[PDB]
Amino acid sequence: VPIQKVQDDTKTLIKTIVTRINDISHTQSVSSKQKVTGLDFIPGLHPILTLSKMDQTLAVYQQILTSMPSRNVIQISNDLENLRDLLHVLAFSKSCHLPWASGLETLDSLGGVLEASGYSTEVVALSRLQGSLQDMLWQLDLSPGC
Amino acid sequence: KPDPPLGLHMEITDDGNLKISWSSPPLVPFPLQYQVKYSENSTTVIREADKIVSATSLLVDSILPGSSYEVQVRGKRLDGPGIWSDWSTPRVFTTQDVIYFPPKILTSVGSNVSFHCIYKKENKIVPSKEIVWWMNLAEKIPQSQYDVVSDHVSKVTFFNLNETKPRGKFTYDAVYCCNEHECHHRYAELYVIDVNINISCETDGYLTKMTCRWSTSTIQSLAESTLQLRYHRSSLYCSDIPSIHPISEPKDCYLQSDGFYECIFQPIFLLSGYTMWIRINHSLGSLDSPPTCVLPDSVVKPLPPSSVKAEITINIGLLKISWEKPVFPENNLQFQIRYGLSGKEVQWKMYEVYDAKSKSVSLPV
Numbered sequence A: 001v002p003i004q005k006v007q008d009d010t011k012t013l014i015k016t017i018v019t020r021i022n023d024i025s026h027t028q029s030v031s032s033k034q035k036v037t038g039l040d041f042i043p044g045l046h047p048i049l050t051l052s053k054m055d056q057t058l059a060v061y062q063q064i065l066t067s068m069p070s071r072n073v074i075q076i077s078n079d080l081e082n083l084r085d086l087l088h089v090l091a092f093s094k095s096c097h098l099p100w101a102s103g104l105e106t107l108d109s110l111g112g113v114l115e116a117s118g119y120s121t122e123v124v125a126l127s128r129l130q131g132s133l134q135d136m137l138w139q140l141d142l143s144p145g146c
Numbered sequence B: 001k002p003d004p005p006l007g008l009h010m011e012i013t014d015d016g017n018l019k020i021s022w023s024s025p026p027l028v029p030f031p032l033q034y035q036v037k038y039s040e041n042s043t044t045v046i047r048e049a050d051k052i053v054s055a056t057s058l059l060v061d062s063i064l065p066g067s068s069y070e071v072q073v074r075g076k077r078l079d080g081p082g083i084w085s086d087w088s089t090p091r092v093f094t095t096q097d098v099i100y101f102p103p104k105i106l107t108s109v110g111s112n113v114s115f116h117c118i119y120k121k122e123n124k125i126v127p128s129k130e131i132v133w134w135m136n137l138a139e140k141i142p143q144s145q146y147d148v149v150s151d152h153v154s155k156v157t158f159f160n161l162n163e164t165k166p167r168g169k170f171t172y173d174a175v176y177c178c179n180e181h182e183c184h185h186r187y188a189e190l191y192v193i194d195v196n197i198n199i200s201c202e203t204d205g206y207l208t209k210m211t212c213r214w215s216t217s218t219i220q221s222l223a224e225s226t227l228q229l230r231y232h233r234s235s236l237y238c239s240d241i242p243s244i245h246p247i248s249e250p251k252d253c254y255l256q257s258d259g260f261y262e263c264i265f266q267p268i269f270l271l272s273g274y275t276m277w278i279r280i281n282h283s284l285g286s287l288d289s290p291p292t293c294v295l296p297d298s299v300v301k302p303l304p305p306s307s308v309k310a311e312i313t314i315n316i317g318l319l320k321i322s323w324e325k326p327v328f329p330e331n332n333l334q335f336q337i338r339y340g341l342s343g344k345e346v347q348w349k350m351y352e353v354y355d356a357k358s359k360s361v362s363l364p365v
Helices: A003-023 A051-067 A071-093 A110-116 A118-139
Strands: B006-012 B018-023 B032-041 B046-053 B057-060 B068-077 B091-094 B098-101 B104-107 B113-119 B131-135 B146-148 B154-158 B173-179 B188-192 B199-203 B210-215 B226-233 B249-251 B260-265 B274-281 B286-288 B292-294 B306-312 B318-324 B335-339 B349-353 B360-364
Touching (some): A003 A071, A003 A118, A051 A071, A051 A110, A110 A118, B006 B068, B018 B068, B032 B057, B046 B057, B104 B113, B113 B131, B113 B173, B113 B188, B131 B154, B154 B173, B199 B274, B199 B292, B226 B260, B318 B335, B349 B360
Parallel strands (some): B104 B188
Antiparallel strands (some): B006 B018, B018 B057, B032 B046, B032 B068, B098 B113, B113 B154, B146 B154, B173 B188, B199 B210, B210 B260, B226 B274, B274 B286, B274 B292, B335 B349
């Protein structure tokens, strides 16, 4: 397994997902950093220093995206799955043992927000996903560690 | 007292053995032990044999040509002092005068196929030296392919087999094994059909679904043939050598107006390699096309760049051409531009831009 090729593919996949979110017009106008109450459970911009943190973050995002009926979102979820697999193979090439992250145990609350306000949940989840991917891409050259 | 066994059937295996099968009664909740009495009657040797088996099938080795097999099966409870059931209705099977094993072979182009025969002349097995093989009663098979496995059975080996051309309605080759110059009516059927089916997959401009198209030009010559696309999804990427996987999933493909079958995968996995092939399930046998593995992230078509503006620079005299990079793919990009004089026919001059970060090019005119 070529490490460099996997890293470059990971970069391309990240940009691809970012562009996908860019296509979604309503998400672009919404501030990524801005805090909205109730969405706090979504893993937004809070320093993601390590590979295990990245894995659990992506796992939670996949779990949240799976519940929302949208064609674009399913593809994004698949890309996130591929991204996790790429991170796992990289963690193997670095001699790290990444345990397979379960999603959030605490989804019993997410149903309420999805029912009351779908629009807020979708725009926030997408914008925070884009932000999280951007810092991950920034840090991927800094020699991330486990 | 259990009911007598039903559904007594006799078939011929590919190895040249007689398989006798029967169905257990549907009202016995306990396993049954069966006694089978079978008599083989030829013009010279008459044999009777009783066999006790726990299974519902029995194998008889070296079924003799031109002989009558009479079979009766009865059952008993396996555990405890059960009562023997009444004998079933006797089944009589009459064989032919020449044995080909295996009688039929379904193979592909370039494979090696071995055919074995036993020739009977007046209830006497001809030695393998006298056996001569012919193809469709047209020409004698060369003696180099002839092999004597045993004194009773002869065989022929075919290496690097080509596709059998259709001679009228018959799409197979009839291989005859004969006693010297004089030949018999029965033969062995060789079906070499074209399984080389090219499947081309393509994703949409938004990378949401993948449509795979394949043609039916080489399979129109065979009736009663069912075609099913089988695909296996790997966890990551494609292997260097695609192969048939035992665990596979069928795909619903629909025929279009152009004669191509299209199958739409929605949703699609971008970096998961799909190994696909075509399974043709004939009346006797199933064949698989050479599998091809496709990665959707590498089949990126998408829409040509938009906002293409062609202006001419003032006081410079250079044709400035600008565009906007499409949403997909996000890899480094190269561009091909044709520019010419507008008219009924445009003489297209070609230019290539290999810079990924290039959005506007100035050219002399």
